[PDB]
Design goal:
The structure is cut from a larger assembly and holds chains A (104 residues), B (125 residues), C (103 residues) and D (442 residues). Chain A has one helix and six strands, in the order βββαβββ. Chain A has 104 residues and is mostly beta strands. Chain B has 125 residues and is mainly alpha-helical. Chain B contains five helices and two strands, in the order αααββαα. Chain C is mainly beta. Chain C has one helix at residues 44-52; strands at 6-20, 24-33, 36-42, 59-64, 70-76, 90-91, 99-102. In chain C, strands 1, 2, 3, 4, 5, 6 and 7 form a seven-stranded mixed β-sheet that branches. The radius of gyration of chain C is 15 Å and the shape is globular. The chains are: A mainly beta (104), B mainly alpha (125), C mainly beta (103), D alpha/beta (442). Chains in contact: A-B, A-C, B-C, B-D, C-D. At the B-D interface, helix 1, helix 2, helix 3 and helix 4 of B face strand 6, helix 2, helix 3, strand 14 and helix 5 of D. Chain C: It comes from Saccharomyces cerevisiae (strain ATCC 204508 / S288c).
């Protein structure tokens, strides 16, 4: 049994800011659930991880901070695959039970 | 019996205008208000005047040099309501909060003008 | 049956200043734990292994003195609020000494 | 149960004056001009004789049509005259000087002095670090003109505390002062304060009590009863302590097992479940709330702020000040100055570490010494001997420093400013000694 802290919500809006020379990248990400909404100040490796595997507005994603892997769950129900918006707290400590054989 | 008691302490500690303690020559000058904020401003005006006079030998000790420099390590973020660890910051009024219950109970239904006096404690207005 | 001694330095990196004799002659590393700090001179091969793990200032590392293996545990908790979101895991400081000796 | 808090009780007996027959015109007078309290007395006693708050009232009697004056402990006789007390200090400086002059006349009367043509005794005095010279100019204008003093010495109270705990005058240590309006870290090398490396943090006891006032008015905005400054002062003095580890104590202080023991409730004077609610545990503690109770509507819960109010002197950015704490300034002084490469301590650094002294009136908070010791083992090399000393009453060590300096006759004359030097050098001239200030220029 192991526990891993996870972040999963719906992307509201993403700003990518470049300097004059483009050496330093600054960013802001707004992500919400059905119960809360927040804005995060992004670092450089978050910016490179979001530019790769392109994430737009209205996208439901799951972010692992300690490993840097971000997966797109789907798209939210916003006509303006289709997955519903997540609920509860944005930052959940979740316990996953692993079973591994002796041969592995 | 109560209102008469302070009169005794009054006549015990009275000092007349010909005061027994100060010297014979008074020459008491007029006094301005001279508020606390004003003193630092006239001080930096004075040392700026002296620095411009000396520039056209070099001082090192001023009132800027005694004041503690800002930190190099990053600061710790805290919740503006409970004082716990602040994980999230609201995008509308920039108030850090702990979890969803605090957000829905305080941060969302808040009256305006209270966010500035929230941010006044850490001076973020 | 072989009798061997395990010697381990661990802690948060405070100083990483190489110098050239380009060829580097030695690097000096300063490690910090909850019981104090301790600085070490290092040979350039362990500096190359430090550069293998992408070790910067503030990273908790693991150095074995005899073998020379370098393991990067992760960034320390004192630098956990430089960004609100980052791909770097954060580990607390070791509660013991930097130097550990075991037979 | 819920305890109750009121204003502190008033003094039944006024301050007595010393006997006039024991006066001599050769003993000096030591006066600590503190913002919170004034300590004064003759040098021949080890303990000061007069301690009272620095305040004055112009009481007007209706049947007398006279403006009576109550100073210090005389203000502790009526609630109305205690509420009307006005301190001469506005922040870290002195603004009006008539109040100071009348206070000085009061303490000259109450010390048992029979002077003629001014005060015949030399005066020991305190000055803040790197003071704007208008204050010392007005101090000269009071003393050398109105009071006809033979000699006046200027110094810093933390350095006087260091002299009191090191009477040789040639020691080496680090002084941390926690005053009413500021916090100072001054390094001492060879008995002399290195004032080019001293640092000041704009925080004190007054700012901490104001922080508690703003936090407490913020937590319960619909509270009906208004409480005074003294009530915030006494619940700051009573239920505040320094946490040993702030980053560990926060994450468990809202746990239900922690509010069973570490929650204190006080009462203002007058005459689905809640087990999973963080906000309910923060507001009304680990007990169910009766919103219709009049007594429970006059209750104050202190759970988080007990470790949050005294912590601001270590992280000043919580109080709105973009300054470093005591730990960061001490680390910078002991590891990057005085010829100390980081990772290789010099001998001056080791001697400064071995004689760390805490003084000031705000050092009475519990857990301060152990927390300072833990940080000092944090940023120092292993095996470095750290000694931290704190007196039983660190609010009185400056006056004992006055007594120890004026008893020691050898280096006493290096600090005295006579009338002749005042008239010949004018008012802008600094006596450069160990315990006092330094020149602004090189």
């Amino acid at each position: 049994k192991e526990e891993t802290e996870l972040i999963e919500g719906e992307v509201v809006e993403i700003q990518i800011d470049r300097s004059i020379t483009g050496g330093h990248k600054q960013g802001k990400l707004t992500i919400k659930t059905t119960d809360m909404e927040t804005i995060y100040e992004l670092g450089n490796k978050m910016i490179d991880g979001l530019t790769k595997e392109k994430v737009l507005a209205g996208d439901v994603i799951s972010i692992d901070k300690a490993s840097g892997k971000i997966t797109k769950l789907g798209r939210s129900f916003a006509r303006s695959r289709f997955v519903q918006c997540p609920e509860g707290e944005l930052q959940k400590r979740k316990t996953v039970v692993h079973t591994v054989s002796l041969h592995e | 019996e109560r209102l008469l008691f302070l009169r005794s302490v009054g006549e015990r500690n009275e000092i007349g205008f010909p005061s027994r303690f100060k010297s014979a020559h008074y020459k008491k000058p007029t006094r301005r208000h001279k508020s606390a904020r004003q003193l630092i401003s006239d001080e930096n005006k004075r040392i700026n005047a002296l620095l411009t006079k000396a520039n056209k030998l070099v001082p090192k000790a001023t009132y800027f040099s005694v004041e503690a420099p800002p930190s190099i390590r990053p600061a710790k973020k805290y919740c503006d309501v409970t004082g716990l660890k602040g994980f999230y910051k609201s995008p509308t009024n920039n108030i850090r909060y702990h979890n969803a219950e605090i957000y829905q109970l305080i941060v969302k239904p808040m009256a305006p003008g209270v966010d500035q006096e929230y941010l006044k404690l850490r001076g973020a207005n | 049956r072989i009798k061997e001694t395990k010697e381990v330095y661990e802690g948060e990196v405070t100083e990483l200043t190489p110098e050239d004799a380009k060829t580097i002659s030695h690097v000096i590393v300063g490690l910090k734990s909850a019981k104090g700090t301790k600085t070490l001179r290092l040979d350039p091969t362990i500096y190359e292994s430090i550069q293998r793990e992408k070790v910067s200032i503030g990273d908790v590392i693991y150095i074995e003195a005899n073998t020379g293996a370098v393991k990067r545990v992760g960034r320390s908790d004192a630098y956990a609020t430089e960004f609100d979101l980052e791909t770097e895991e954060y580990v607390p400081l070791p509660k013991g000494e930097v130097h550990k000796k075991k037979e | 149960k819920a305890v109750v808090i009121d204003d502190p009780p008033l003094r039944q007996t006024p301050e007595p004056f010393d006997e006039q027959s024991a006066y001599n015109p050769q003993s000096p007078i030591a006066i600590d001009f503190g913002s919170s309290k004034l300590r004064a007395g003759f040098v021949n006693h080890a303990t000061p004789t007069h301690i009272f708050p620095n305040a004055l009232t112009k009481f007007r009697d209706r049947k007398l049509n006279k403006n009576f004056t109550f100073v210090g402990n005389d203000t502790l006789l009526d609630q109305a005259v205690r509420s009307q007390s006005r301190s001469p200090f506005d922040g870290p400086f002195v603004t009006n000087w008539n109040l100071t002059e009348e206070i000085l006349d009061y303490t000259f009367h109450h010390l048992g002095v029979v002077p003629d043509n001014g005060i015949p005794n030399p005066i020991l005095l305190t000055e803040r670090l790197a003071t704007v010279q208008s204050q010392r100019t007005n101090w000269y204008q009071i003393l050398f003109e109105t009071y006809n003093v033979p000699g006046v010495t200027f110094g810093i109270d933390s350095l006087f505390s260091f002299y009191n705990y090191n009477p040789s005058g040639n020691k080496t240590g680090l002084v941390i002062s926690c005053g009413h309006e500021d916090t100072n870290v001054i390094p001492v090398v060879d008995g002399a304060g290195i004032l080019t490396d001293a640092k000041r943090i704009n925080w004190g006891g007054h700012q901490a009590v104001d922080y508690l006032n703003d936090l407490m008015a913020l937590k319960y905005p619909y509270f009906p009863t208004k409480m005074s400054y003294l009530q915030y002062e006494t619940m700051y003095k009573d239920y505040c302590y320094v946490s040993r580890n702030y980053d560990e104590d926060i994450e468990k202080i809202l746990t239900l097992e922690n509010l069973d023991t570490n929650d204190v409730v006080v009462e203002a004077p007058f005459t689905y479940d809640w087990r999973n609610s963080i906000l309910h545990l923060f507001l009304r503690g680990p007990r169910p709330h009766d919103s219709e109770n009049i007594h429970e509507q006059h209750q104050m819960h202190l759970n988080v702020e007990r470790i949050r109010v005294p912590e601001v002197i270590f992280q000043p950015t919580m109080g709105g000040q973009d300054q470093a704490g005591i730990c960061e300034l001490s680390e910078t002084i002991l590891l990057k100055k005085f010829g100390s490469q980081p990772g290789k301590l010099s001998q001056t650094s080791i001697d400064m570490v071995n004689n760390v002294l805490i003084t000031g009136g705000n050092a009475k908070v519990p857990g301060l010494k152990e927390r300072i010791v833990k940080e000092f083992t944090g940023f120092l090399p292993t095996g470095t001997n750290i000694t931290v000393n704190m007196s039983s009453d660190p609010s009185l060590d400056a006056w004992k420093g006055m007594a120890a300096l004026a008893r020691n006759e050898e280096q006493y004359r290096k600090t005295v400013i006579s009338k002749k030097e005042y008239e010949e050098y004018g008012p802008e001239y600094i006596k450069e000694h160990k315990l006092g200030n330094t020149k602004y220029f090189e």
